[PDB]
Amino acid sequence: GVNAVHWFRKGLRLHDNPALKECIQGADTIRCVYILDPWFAGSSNVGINRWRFLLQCLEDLDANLRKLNSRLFVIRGQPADVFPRLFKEWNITKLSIEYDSEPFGKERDAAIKKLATEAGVEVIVRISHTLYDLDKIIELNGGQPPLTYKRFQTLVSKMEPLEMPADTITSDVIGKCMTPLSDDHDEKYGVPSLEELGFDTDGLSSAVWPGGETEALTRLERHLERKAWVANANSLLASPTGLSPYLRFGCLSCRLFYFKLTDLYKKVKKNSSPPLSLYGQLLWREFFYTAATNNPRFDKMEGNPICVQIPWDKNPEALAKWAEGRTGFPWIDAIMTQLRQEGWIHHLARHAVACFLTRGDLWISWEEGMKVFEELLLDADWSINAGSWMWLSCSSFFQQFFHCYCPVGFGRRTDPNGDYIRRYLPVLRGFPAKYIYDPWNAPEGIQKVAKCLIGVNYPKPMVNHAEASRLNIERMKQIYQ
Amino acid sequence: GVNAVHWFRKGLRLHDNPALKECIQGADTIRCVYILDPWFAGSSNVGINRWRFLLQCLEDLDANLRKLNSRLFVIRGQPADVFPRLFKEWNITKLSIEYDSEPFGKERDAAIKKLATEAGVEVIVRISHTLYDLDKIIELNGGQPPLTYKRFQTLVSKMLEMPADTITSDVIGKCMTPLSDDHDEKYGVPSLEELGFDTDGLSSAVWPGGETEALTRLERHLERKAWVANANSLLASPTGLSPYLRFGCLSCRLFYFKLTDLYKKVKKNSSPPLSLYGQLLWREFFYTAATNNPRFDKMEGNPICVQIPWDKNPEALAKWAEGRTGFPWIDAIMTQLRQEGWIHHLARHAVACFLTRGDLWISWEEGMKVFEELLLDADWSINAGSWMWLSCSSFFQQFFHCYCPVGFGRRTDPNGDYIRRYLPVLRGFPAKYIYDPWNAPEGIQKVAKCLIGVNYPKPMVNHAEASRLNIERMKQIYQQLS
Numbered sequence A: 001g002v003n004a005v006h007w008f009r010k011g012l013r014l015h016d017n018p019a020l021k022e023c024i025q026g027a028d029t030i031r032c033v034y035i036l037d038p039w040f041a042g043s044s045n046v047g048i049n050r051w052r053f054l055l056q057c058l059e060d061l062d063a064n065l066r067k068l069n070s071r072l073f074v075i076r077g078q079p080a081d082v083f084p085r086l087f088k089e090w091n092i093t094k095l096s097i098e099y100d101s102e103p104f105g106k107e108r109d110a111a112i113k114k115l116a117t118e119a120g121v122e123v124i125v126r127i128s129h130t131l132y133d134l135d136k137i138i139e140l141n142g143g144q145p146p147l148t149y150k151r152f153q154t155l156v157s158k159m160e161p162l163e164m165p166a167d168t169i170t171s172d173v174i175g176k177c178m179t180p181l182s183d184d185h186d187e188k189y190g191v192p193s194l195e196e197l198g199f200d201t202d203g204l205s206s207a208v209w210p211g212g213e214t215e216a217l218t219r220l221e222r223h224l225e226r227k228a229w230v231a232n233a234n235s236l237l238a239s240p241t242g243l244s245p246y247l248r249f250g251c252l253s254c255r256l257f258y259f260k261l262t263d264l265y266k267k268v269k270k271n272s273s274p275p276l277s278l279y280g281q282l283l284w285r286e287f288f289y290t291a292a293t294n295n296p297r298f299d300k301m302e303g304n305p306i307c308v309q310i311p312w313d314k315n316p317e318a319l320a321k322w323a324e325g326r327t328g329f330p331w332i333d334a335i336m337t338q339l340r341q342e343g344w345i346h347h348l349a350r351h352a353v354a355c356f357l358t359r360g361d362l363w364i365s366w367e368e369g370m371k372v373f374e375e376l377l378l379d380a381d382w383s384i385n386a387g388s389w390m391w392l393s394c395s396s397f398f399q400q401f402f403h404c405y406c407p408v409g410f411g412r413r414t415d416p417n418g419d420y421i422r423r424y425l426p427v428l429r430g431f432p433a434k435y436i437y438d439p440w441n442a443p444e445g446i447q448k449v450a451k452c453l454i455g456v457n458y459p460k461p462m463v464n465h466a467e468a469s470r471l472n473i474e475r476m477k478q479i480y481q
Numbered sequence B: 001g002v003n004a005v006h007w008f009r010k011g012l013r014l015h016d017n018p019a020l021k022e023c024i025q026g027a028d029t030i031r032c033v034y035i036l037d038p039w040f041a042g043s044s045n046v047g048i049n050r051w052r053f054l055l056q057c058l059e060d061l062d063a064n065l066r067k068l069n070s071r072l073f074v075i076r077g078q079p080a081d082v083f084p085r086l087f088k089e090w091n092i093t094k095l096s097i098e099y100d101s102e103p104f105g106k107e108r109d110a111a112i113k114k115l116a117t118e119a120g121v122e123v124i125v126r127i128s129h130t131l132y133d134l135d136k137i138i139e140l141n142g143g144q145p146p147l148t149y150k151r152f153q154t155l156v157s158k159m160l161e162m163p164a165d166t167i168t169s170d171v172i173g174k175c176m177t178p179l180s181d182d183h184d185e186k187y188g189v190p191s192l193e194e195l196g197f198d199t200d201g202l203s204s205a206v207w208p209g210g211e212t213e214a215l216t217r218l219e220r221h222l223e224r225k226a227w228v229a230n231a232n233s234l235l236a237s238p239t240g241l242s243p244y245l246r247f248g249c250l251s252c253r254l255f256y257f258k259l260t261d262l263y264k265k266v267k268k269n270s271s272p273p274l275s276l277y278g279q280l281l282w283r284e285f286f287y288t289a290a291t292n293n294p295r296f297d298k299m300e301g302n303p304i305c306v307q308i309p310w311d312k313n314p315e316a317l318a319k320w321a322e323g324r325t326g327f328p329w330i331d332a333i334m335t336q337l338r339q340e341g342w343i344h345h346l347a348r349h350a351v352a353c354f355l356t357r358g359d360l361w362i363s364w365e366e367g368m369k370v371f372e373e374l375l376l377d378a379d380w381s382i383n384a385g386s387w388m389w390l391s392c393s394s395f396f397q398q399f400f401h402c403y404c405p406v407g408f409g410r411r412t413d414p415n416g417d418y419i420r421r422y423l424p425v426l427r428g429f430p431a432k433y434i435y436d437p438w439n440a441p442e443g444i445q446k447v448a449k450c451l452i453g454v455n456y457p458k459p460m461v462n463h464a465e466a467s468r469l470n471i472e473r474m475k476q477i478y479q480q481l482s
């Protein structure tokens, strides 16, 4: 008969999944697969939050599929080795995927399409990770990706109204489509635990960001309700209505979010032409995906056509202290600790520790910061992470920043009372607000009363910002030439 | 054809702009440009008020140019790299600028003239940032700028130039501005975020930039003064004009004439006193003193600056720069400067004396750098000259008076309203203790809920001890020179 397979990679949801909906059409059987690729492997225990989030997404998908009398099939191995066996054993006729625009996903998917052709399997591809058809954006721009966000905004303004979401997969959508199940399904295709991937979980609290479409749809309605009523040092903390990690994994459709925000704006402000501020970072997300699709070395400086060439220092000792939150600047260290512990930090906090690492203080390549964020950040994948680190290190030709963050000062304006620093660095809980952001300048009496001695209980500033930043500012201006 | 470009740097206005008026004459096209030079980069969020004021000046220029069917072209890059490309691409034949007297500007403008010559572009320079032709003052004085303000007054006594008509739709005539479809994307005015500044913690400006704001303030300022014919003077006034004079949103020559006409109307007299013009001639004086002195902002190697061995104490500087000295008078002024970008002239005297010859004995150069980043109404010449003069670093201006960091505030604002506004942690403290919190009972402290050392910092020096020693240092320095 007609045996269909939907391949989950991103887009880990049943709502607004046009590839899955079209794959079910006319099908006698459906199997939803997720393939754990041993390509992604070798991470240490620091990368646990990404894996935990992913596994919780798969658990949620499996549970939602079970309400449809289906299951999620989790298969371990490389897609190129896995899919030819699946095609033969399940007698597959159709394979569906949500389009992936990133270059190595395009490479992977092109190879899998060749194998599908060899097996006589039709391939269904549908766009649903981004608001727009990125290739149409590139085509409208004469075949090259927009070089600036303003150019991107202008291109997007002329393009056809973004496609509306597809109906959720239901009892009715499935119909008489069925999922054949073996007795040992859970043993052979179950979602893995963290331990099975090798991670230590004995010292592990419950997630601040629980994965999955169910969590995301619940957050969406509360996020919309809170913003209607509205019509800070607590925004540095993880919000129970924050949606960004769910947008990265596809537990929440970005097109549904866009529509729900626009409808909210119309209902609250009684106006049909909202400002860009409404959409937050949705268009910047779309922009970095567009800039990366055709550039397989988007994540590299050397040989990358759109990346200014800058002689960053090689300093792994300084990089580690930055990555591990042991810089001596409580503001910077608190941010890296929150990132390491929970996997999300505020957007302004991302700018602060990125400027600190690259153009501001350490003169270390944006590539190294990207790799640490790649390991630790829940809500940014390869395109957006490479794009943001490039842009924020002044390595994009058309975005020169005139401003350089202060590692002490920026924190004081944001949390005058160092509540944020007292939370993520409790060893400084004694220090008062006048010294909490620069503990080195506190007298030894106030240090001892606080029961933390700089240099012993907490480390001293790793550089002098005034000295370092002035030189790096002079370095960058020379580079422009 | 005849394609003209007017280059805005200062003089961000359409009124009293003789360079732009002459550049338009005989031109087939006109484009007004502002060049964002990456040389000014590297500021932290502390420098946001200057940048915000500038961008609002540019926005206003663009909005007023749009009423003339024109646009402001904002280009990012160095003038020396930008202008040769512009000349070829737009086929420019003339380039106009308002004269800039500062050493840096003269150096930049000489390099751009050489590039213009190489391109076959005629260059138009007209004076309109100052009341007078500064070089004529210098020639009048025998080739050297006046050393003292009184000699300067004497020189201008013997010499103001009159203003040109505002650029109108009639003035533009058949001159037009060719526009690309992507103009806004390519030449639009940048936002603060595009320069890297954090705007999330930012309310609306106390000092909104732009000619339109300045001309509105000018009329209300003149009407208020006609009617009159202080603790609230420490606060920003809705009729204050000084930031607009610095950026050239308000012509200083228009202001001079309107003030003179007001005096003639109200007092029925034709010979006004110098006090009528306030800061206008001191502004002119510092521009004249600096224009030939590229090291005017330095002590060592600067010929008119007395050599004084200030201490290098960056810990003390930061407390002064961040308004954490323990003296609520000094701290309130530095806070108001950081948050808004203007403080009263007498407040400037107070925190300058405190930093240099009064208390901390830190070099006037360091105060100037903090002021250059924070202060909206003083540019390089006036800022360097003011810090030199007020730190007794000018040979011919010796001050016999040392400001008191507690007493001066009390005489100015007895209740302490000013301190309660910019330092609300001391809102509870009564007027007897608000200017010196340390000398107050712990009971009044606890009731006020600010404990010194806990909610606000303690005095960083003993003024009596420090000032006496610094006064002794100063008398010693002068004697070695005499």
Ligand SMILES: Cc1ccc(-n2nc3c(c2NC(=O)c2ccc(C(=O)c4ccccc4)cc2)CSC3)c(C)c1
Binding pocket: A244, A281, A284, A285, A347, A350, A351, A354, A373, A379, A380, A384, A385, A387, A388, A389, A391, A392, A399, B193, B194, B195, B196
């Ligand atoms: C270091 C870093 C890494 C990743 C992220 N990040 N995460 C996500 C997103 C991003 N980026 C971003 O929004 C992002 C947005 C703008 C710029 C920019 O240049 C720029 C240009 C002009 C004015 C202000 C700014 C750079 C990055 C969007 S979707 C989840 C960030 C903010 C920082």
Ligand SMILES: Cc1ccc(-n2nc3c(c2NC(=O)c2ccc(C(=O)c4ccccc4)cc2)CSC3)c(C)c1
Binding pocket: B242, B279, B282, B283, B345, B348, B349, B352, B371, B377, B378, B382, B383, B385, B386, B387, B389, B390, B397
């Ligand atoms: C620390 C500081 C920095 C800048 C300024 N400032 N701002 C602006 C201006 C100025 N200066 C000034 O008027 C200024 C005026 C006079 C003297 C002087 O020696 C002096 C000489 C005799 C009697 C009183 C005083 C010093 C500075 C004029 S246009 C905007 C000030 C007052 C202080």
